[PDB]
C-alpha cells in the first residue's frame, strides 16, 4: 500500500488523497469523506 493506516500513517506525495484502502489518488474514491478518505481529503 502507499499511505494511511495500511502504510504506517504515511502521507501521499504531491498532496494526493489517501483512500480508505491505503492508495494515493485524486478522484472521489480516494478523496471524498463519503468514501472514508484518510488524509489530504476534499469535500
UniProtKB/Swiss-Prot annotation:
Effect of residue 14 to D: Possible deamidation
Top-rank taxon, per record: Eukaryota
Ranges where the Chitin-binding type-1 domain occurs: 1-43
Disulfide bridge map: 3-18, 12-24, 17-31, 37-41
Protein's recorded name: Hevein
Lineage, uppermost ranks: Eukaryota, Viridiplantae, Streptophyta, Embryophyta, Tracheophyta
Gene name in the database record: HEV1
Location of this fragment in the whole protein: 18 to 60 of 204
Amino acid at each position: 500500500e502507499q499511505c494511511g493506516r495500511q502504510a504506517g500513517g504515511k502521507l501521499c506525495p504531491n498532496n494526493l488523497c489517501c483512500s480508505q484502502w491505503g492508495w494515493c489518488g485524486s478522484t472521489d474514491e480516494y478523496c471524498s469523506p463519503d468514501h472514508n478518505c484518510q488524509s489530504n481529503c476534499k469535500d
